[PDB]
Every structure is written in structure tokens, then in C-alpha cells.
Design a protein around this ligand. Structure first.
Ligand code: HEM
Ligand code: HEM
Ligand code: ARR
Ligand code: ARR
Ligand code: H4B
Ligand code: H4B
Ligand code: ZN
Lengths: 419, 419
């Protein structure tokens, strides 16, 4: 039957039944738990080589179709059976099917709604879908992406959107965005061992340069897009600087802050994930939403593996920077989140603090349970990198399963690409 | 073979082989992950009813014995085989065996070393073992416990120790400490719905009163012990107030702090867990170590389900207590951890900040891997309730398995007790 789940802060108990509809085996073994593994194969969907077997495509297809029409308040039996027949023919005749633009909008919000590591899923039904399935060239991809960045950025009033490029076929003509985020900074590795810019993109940065891009060697050089259409080699496209919106970080109290010289783009859009729906796969479909404070303040700026500015901020706060026990890091990182949240609102770019996010998620989780008796949640990712216990999510038990549709990771294109 | 595991902050990768020696199935299913479930049956060892089958006792016994002698630098083949034979006879003849005091010391440190949710395991080999197996009465249990509290408290210079009361037998004459922590406060529920003291002990508190204890209705009334010897009903014993050491909390800056009227015992000792070694079970064996700041400051004082003083501390800090986005909680809880860490050191009681703890654990994890290619770690518990990302553990992948010996949870004695 169900799986009992409890929140220790409110004592409220829940029953998770939805997991019953999970696809394959997840990351965990019967006798061992690998829930802290970041990039597990259970969460990845790699390179295809031939069409996907009709035997398995048709089953999945019927599954989705049924799920779609099931979404409806008071169904359309006629319509439902009609499309059911209509899709089978197509598969039989063509080898694959196509989703009605509406079924794709449904597919994109469900895949989101089913993302265990997302804390903003309360917004799941507010998604702008840009159908670019008819696309055929890098030049065209680039245009669609510019349209998206402009729409999504909304002069600062962020809007959630996703651009759905062509579905995969034989897997030999895949559409891919070699980037990992539409807008992101470059990571260079100065001769003297030093790493300047964003260490997390050191490797991708290199490739870009290897593809003709000109390295401007600086902490905030926005990388160019690296588009791949119909499975051809990639082409490098510079984004119109007028389209990239950045926030200059400044502290509502510490004016010494500006001197740190810290800015950060205002649009968070993942460009390297695969949408899976009804047995179909779209290896290229960038999507955005808005930021949650901590993403920038705590992880981007403080991670030692990222911009690592936690000591500098402390020194400039005149803190016992050599006495771990003093809790100076707890002091630093917080003022830093204050700069980040204030620097966004000041300039009026949509931003969301982590206490509120953590809160809307419980509301969402409450709905998902009354709605469909279940909500795939990855506790490790859903809990903020700061304030753990201080947030309601922390005291909430969850179950983490992969349903369908879903947003999978993929393998670095430059790794599985026949040039 | 091994399971690849990586730290994202240092990039250093590891191979976990030790998991191969895991006992039974853990909390997770092939297709679903229940890693955030607190009290899973995979981590619990309940009431026994008859002796444990010789068929399964002997196998486990040989297992441990072999493991013990294996601990030795340059083995004692003779001795090893001798004890191997010696134990089998005993089991054959008596129905169970007894551990040489030395094998028990080894058993207590390994069970600790194998506790996935412990962040201080670097200290695993420093454990004081108090052999009370010969015990037979509540009066005797009470004495042993007083000896332990006095030794462990060490006038403030905390010392790690464990008292091993009689092993289980037919399960009908079990030794149990109905408490959950040697020293702890009481939770009363004032007529007017109010809860005063420590909400977490509301239920246990009641029982105590139900057993004759006199409710002194106050935020810090230390509960009496509730001892059960040879499987008889429990008897209530007041702890000598001279043995309980408490720290009065005060802020090294905010003198308004004292007015909060906050103190907390200085000895953290779990009294309700079961030690499992060589197929044997000791349902009664309290053990202690010292505190990690956050345990008190973040969880005990702030949890809404505990003492919940996070708003009050903020008001008294003159913070935008009605603007979640202001990050006032991040501000509060930190100063509170500063009061807690400073109030302990001032009075000279051993305390440990969470950044250092999180650090020694990585060192430990590094050793456990070079030592035995594995370390059962429960990421969710090992990561602090504050400063998540700011600590090295956060960026460390881990595997969580139950080995042997091990410290299991048990079922509330008052639930499975034939009065
Ligand atoms: C509306 C605002 C949104 C907020 C505030 C939000 C917030 C978050 C946060 C904080 C993460 C953490 C990423 C990291 O730490 O690396 C995340 C991940 C994710 N979100 Fe959302 N999200 C939002 C919208 C969306 C949208 C529009 C989609 C897709 C349609 C989405 C899909 C996901 C997925 C799949 C992940 C997992 C990424 C990964 O595993 O690498 N989110 N989200
Ligand atoms: C030396 C200092 C030690 C420190 C600083 C330490 C710290 C911790 C912390 C912070 C917890 C978290 C408990 C909670 O959040 O509820 C914990 C749990 C635990 N520790 Fe340690 N520990 C220490 C010593 C020991 C000792 C001496 C033993 C046993 C011989 C031990 C066995 C465990 C076990 C089994 C748990 C799990 C408790 C549970 O699951 O409820 N620890 N420890
Ligand atoms: N708030 C967001 N921020 C955000 C979301 C996803 C990511 C991706 C981070 N994952 C890193 C990673 C590591 C390894 C492989 C892959 Cl595919 C991806 C980053 C910021 C939003 C993203 C999309 C909508 S909102
Ligand atoms: N630092 C410590 N603190 C500490 C350790 C364990 C616990 C137990 C908390 N577990 C709660 C719980 C909940 C449900 C069932 C059981 Cl058995 C136990 C509390 C503080 C030490 C404990 C023992 C040595 S040190
Ligand atoms: C090892 C562990 O899985 C890893 O550090 C996770 C923890 N939680 C996270 N949570 C979010 N939101 N994002 C991350 O990148 C991570 N990293
Ligand atoms: C639901 C979740 O497992 C639960 O809140 C856990 C999280 N991590 C924890 N970590 C420690 N050390 N102690 C706890 O009590 C908890 N509670
Ligand atoms: Zn798991």
C-alpha cells in the first residue's frame, strides 16, 4: 500500500502512494544507500544510436496519452480514444510520433513537477513553452535562444520559460546545447597555476577557445553559446550583450562591499538536460525560472570550488578569520546573502530568499499529496546550503523516485560526439 | 568491485569496498530512496522473545571472534583458534557466550566506528568501558550510572565512556533504561494547552509522573532515571543534583541574553540504544561523548518542536521579525550558537563548534578509507543544521550501510513491556 512519511516539526504524517508508479531502479541498493551521489546513472539518459524499438515506444506512448487526457477535468473519451488510435498509426507508419503543442506544454510542466531536486515546483503550472521543434540550423537555434533570453529576462521581471527544440530520432542527428546554462561566466587558468573567472567552467571554457572563441581572461566574461543542430558539429554564437542582464552586488550596509567587484547574471536557465515524455526524448530544451538567494550568495560566491570569496568577505568584516571556532563563516556567508538579496531587489530583478522558498515547497508538498498522494523529493537538494534546521523542509521526510515525464542529465556532448 | 565516491570541493575520488560486508537490506528500495526516514526498521532492533537460534548465533559469533583477532597487529593464530573453539563449546553447552572484557572494549569502539550518523567518530578509539554485565538490580544499575555520570562529567573536562549492562538472554529478562538520555529536561503540558519545559519529553515525562515522580513544572526540571533490571518493572531514581553539571547560557556581547534564562546540561549520553556484537545484544548500555555546538544552540533551543526560542532572540536583537526575506533567522540562530559555544568555554566544559567537527570527520573519513576502504556515513545526519555548504562534509559523497557491531534503536520499553 502506501509509505508512511512524517514531518517532525509539525508531527503531521503522510502516506506516499505515488512512488508505485516509478520507472526503473533508482540510485539505491537493497542493502546500501547512495542517496548523496550527485550524478547517478539512474538520473541520466545518454546517447542513443538507432531509433528506439517500436515495441517499447508504443507502450510508453499510450501511457503518456492516457496520462494527458487524464489531466482533464471531465474527460473527452472520444478525443482520448481518437488520439490513442491516431498516435499508434503514426508510430506504425512513421516510426515515432509528434506531440500536439498542448500535450507538449503538459509534458513540460509535469516533467518539472516531477523534478525531485527542485524547490520552486509550486510554480510548476506557470511555464512559458516556446515550440521550436521545427528548427533546423544553429542560426535558428541561436535565434530561438535569444527570443527566450529576452522574454525570460523581461527587463528584470523574470518569467519562467522553456524552448523545446526538435525531439531525438535515430540519435544520429541530435540537437544539443553544449553549454550547461544559457548565460554563465568563463573559467580561465592563468599560467601561474591560478584560476580566474569561474572554476566550474574551466573545461567548457577551454573547448570554446578551442572552437575559435577569444578568451577575454576575466572573472566575469560571459561564455558564448555552442549550438549543435541536426547532429552536426557545433557552432559558436556570441550572445547580444544587450540581452544579458547582470546584478552588481552591493551591501545595504557595508559600502566596502562594492570594492569586491561582484556581479552575476539575473537569469538561471539550464541548457544541457533532456526532457523525456511518452517514450520521446528532446536532448535540447533549455528552460529557466528565477534564482533563490543561496544559489548565488552561498554556492556560487562561497564554494571553495567556485568563486570562493568567503575569507575575503570575513577579513573585510574584521573577523577572527583564523579561529574556525569563532563562527566567522556563519557571520560572513549571511551578510553575503544579504548583499545578494538586496542587490537584486534594489535593481528590481526577481529573487527569492531561501526561507520563503523552503516554505512554499511545504505548501506544494502538501498539495501534491492531496492531489496525487505523492511528491518525488530529494531531501539533500531541497534543503538550503545554509539554515538547514531553521527551515521546515529539514524536518520533513520524503521519498525520491523518478517518474515520467522527467528531466534527465546527459553526457557531455564533447565526450560522445562524432566530429 | 568498489563504488566510486567523490568530493566535489576537492575533486578527490574514493572507492568504497567495505559496503560489501553489509548485513541486511537497508532503508532503500531498488526503485525508491527512503534515505531521509529517521527511524527506519533497518536501523532498529526490537524485543526478543526466546533465545536466539543456535544455528544463527554460532555463525555470527565466529564472525566477530575472527574480526577481533583480525584487529591485531601480528596475530595470535593459537589464541585465535583457542577462543574459536572455546566459544563454540560455551554456546553448545550454555546456549550463548560471553565476551572477554577486551573483546567488549573492541566491540564498543567498532559499533561506534560503524555509526553512520556520528560526526565525532575520529575519537572512536577513545572510549572508556565500564563493565557492569554482572549487574542484577535497579539499585545496582543506578549506582553504575552515577559512577558513569561522575566519571564522564569530569568536573567539566568531558570524557567519553559507556556502561555495558547485562546482555539479553531469553529476552524475557532484559535490562533497559526507559530514558533516552541519562540527563534531560522535562516536558509538561500546562492546562491552558501550553507546553512548558522540553516538548520532546512530554510523553516520557508523563510516564515518570505516572510512576510516582513529582512534577516540578518548569523549563529545566531534570527527569529521574527509570531503570529496569533483569526484565522486571522499572524503578524511579533521582540523580544526585551534585552529579548533573549545567551551563548557564550568556552572550559574550548581548548582556540582555542572560534574561532569556537558558541553561543546559553538559553531558550528552544516549541511554536507549542496543549494542549488537557477535550475535549478542545488550539492550542497556548508555554511552556519552561531548557536545557539538549546533546540537544545543540550533536544534534544542531553536527547533520549533523543542524549546523554540528563535523569534524571542530575534526581537531582542531588534530584527525585522516579520519579514522572512530579511534573513533575521540566519542572524539569530548564529548569535545563539555564539552564546552556546562561549557559555561552555567560559565555564570550561568541553564543547566543539560544527566547523571543526565537520572537518575532523573528513580526516576520519580519509583514514577509514585508507584503513578499510569504506566508512558508513549518513550524509543527512552528518551535515550540520546550519552552514551546510560552508562545511567540507556537504560536498562529500558517502555510502550508508549497517555493519557489525552496531548501535540500533529499540522500541519504547513502555510499549513492549509486560507489567
Ligand atoms: C520558478 C523558480 C524556480 C526556482 C526558484 C527554482 C529553484 C531551484 C533550485 C534552487 C535548484 C538548485 C540547483 C543547484 O543547486 O544546482 C533547482 C533545480 C532544478 N529545477 Fe528548479 N527552480 C525554479 C524553476 C524551475 C523550472 C522552470 C524548471 C523547469 C521547467 C525547474 C527544474 C529544475 C530541475 C530539473 C532542477 C534540477 C537541476 C539539477 O539536478 O542539476 N526549476 N531549482
Ligand atoms: C566524542 C564526541 C562525540 C561527538 C561530538 C558526537 C557527535 C554526534 C552528533 C552531533 C550526533 C547527532 C545527534 C542528533 O543530532 O540527534 C551524534 C550521534 C550519534 N553518535 Fe556521536 N558523537 C560523539 C561521541 C559518540 C560516542 C562516544 C558514541 C558511542 C560510543 C557515539 C555514537 C553515536 C550514535 C550511534 C549516534 C546516532 C544517534 C541516533 O541515531 O539517534 N557518538 N554524535
Ligand atoms: N533556479 C534555477 N537555477 C539553476 C537550475 C539548474 C542548474 C543546474 C546545476 N546543475 C549542475 C550540473 C552538474 C552536472 C551535470 C548537469 Cl546536466 C548539471 C543551475 C541553476 C533555475 C534553473 C532553471 C530554472 S530555474
Ligand atoms: N554528542 C552526543 N549527543 C547526542 C547523541 C545522541 C542523541 C540521541 C538523539 N536521538 C533521538 C532518538 C529518536 C528516536 C529514537 C531514539 Cl533511540 C533516539 C542525542 C544527543 C553524544 C551522544 C553520545 C555521545 S555523544
Ligand atoms: C554530495 C552531495 O550530494 C552534493 O554536495 C549536493 C548536496 N546538496 C545540493 N543541493 C543543491 N541544491 N545543489 C547542489 O549542487 C547540491 N550538492
Ligand atoms: C527528516 C530528516 O531525516 C530529519 O529531519 C533529520 C535530518 N538530519 C538530522 N541530523 C542530525 N544530526 N540529527 C537529526 O535529528 C536530524 N534530523
Ligand atoms: Zn537510499
Amino acid at each position: 500500500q502506501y509509505v508512511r512519511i512524517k514531518n517532525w516539526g509539525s508531527g503531521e504524517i503522510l502516506h506516499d502512494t505515488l512512488h508505485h508508479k516509478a520507472t526503473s531502479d533508482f540510485t539505491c541498493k537493497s542493502k546500501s544507500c547512495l542517496g548523496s551521489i550527485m550524478n547517478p546513472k539512474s538520473l541520466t539518459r545518454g546517447p542513443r544510436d538507432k531509433p528506439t524499438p517500436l515495441e517499447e515506444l508504443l507502450p510508453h506512448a499510450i501511457e503518456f496519452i492516457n496520462q494527458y487526457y487524464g489531466s482533464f477535468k471531465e474527460a473527452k473519451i472520444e478525443e482520448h480514444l481518437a488520439r490513442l488510435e491516431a498516435v499508434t498509426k503514426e508510430i506504425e507508419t512513421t516510426g515515432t510520433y509528434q506531440l500536439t503543442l498542448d500535450e507538449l506544454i503538459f509534458a513540460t510542466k509535469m516533467a518539472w513537477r516531477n523534478a525531485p531536486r527542485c524547490i520552486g515546483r509550486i510554480q510548476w503550472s506557470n511555464l512559458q513553452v516556446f515550440d521550436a521543434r521545427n528548427c533546423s540550423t544553429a542560426q535558428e537555434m541561436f535565434q530561438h535562444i535569444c527570443r527566450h533570453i529576452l522574454y525570460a529576462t523581461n527587463n528584470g521581471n523574470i518569467r519562467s520559460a522553456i524552448t523545446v527544440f526538435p525531439q531525438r530520432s535515430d540519435g544520429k542527428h541530435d540537437f544539443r546545447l553544449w553549454n550547461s546554462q544559457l548565460i554563465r561566466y568563463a573559467g580561465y587558468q592563468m599560467p601561474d597555476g591560478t584560476i580566474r573567472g569561474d572554476a566550474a567552467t574551466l573545461e567548457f571554457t577551454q573547448l570554446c577557445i578551442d572552437l575559435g572563441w577569444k578568451p577575454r581572461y576575466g572573472r566575469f566574461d560571459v561564455l558564448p553559446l555552442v549550438l549543435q543542430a541536426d547532429g552536426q558539429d557545433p557552432e559558436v554564437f556570441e550572445i547580444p550583450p544587450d540581452l544579458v542582464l547582470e546584478v552588481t552586488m552591493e551591501h545595504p550596509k557595508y559600502e566596502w562591499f562594492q570594492e569586491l567587484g561582484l556581479k552575476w547574471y539575473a537569469l538561471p536557465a539550464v541548457a544541457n538536460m533532456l526532457l523525456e515524455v511518452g517514450g520521446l526524448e528532446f536532448p535540447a530544451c533549455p528552460f529557466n525560472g528565477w534564482y533563490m538567494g543561496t544559489e548565488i550568495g552561498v554556492r556560487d560566491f562561497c564554494d571553495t570550488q567556485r568563486y570562493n570569496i568567503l575569507e575575503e568577505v570575513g577579513r573585510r568584516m574584521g573577523l577572527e578569520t583564523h579561529t574556525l571556532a569563532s563562527l566567522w563563516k556563519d557571520r560572513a556567508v549571511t551578510e553575503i546573502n544579504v548583499a545578494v538579496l538586496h542587490s537584486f531587489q534594489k535593481q528590481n530583478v526577481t529573487i527569492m530568499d531561501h526561507h520563503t522558498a523552503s516554505e512554499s515547497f511545504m505548501k506544494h508538498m502538501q498539495n501534491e499529496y492531496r492531489a496525487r498522494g505523492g511528491c518525488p523529493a530529494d531531501w539533500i537538494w531541497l534543503v538550503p546550503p545554509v539554515s538547514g534546521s531553521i527551515t521546515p523542509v529539514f524536518h520533513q521526510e520524503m521519498l525520491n523516485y523518478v517518474l515520467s515525464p522527467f528531466y534527465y542529465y546527459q553526457i557531455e556532448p564533447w565526450k560522445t560526439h562524432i566530429w
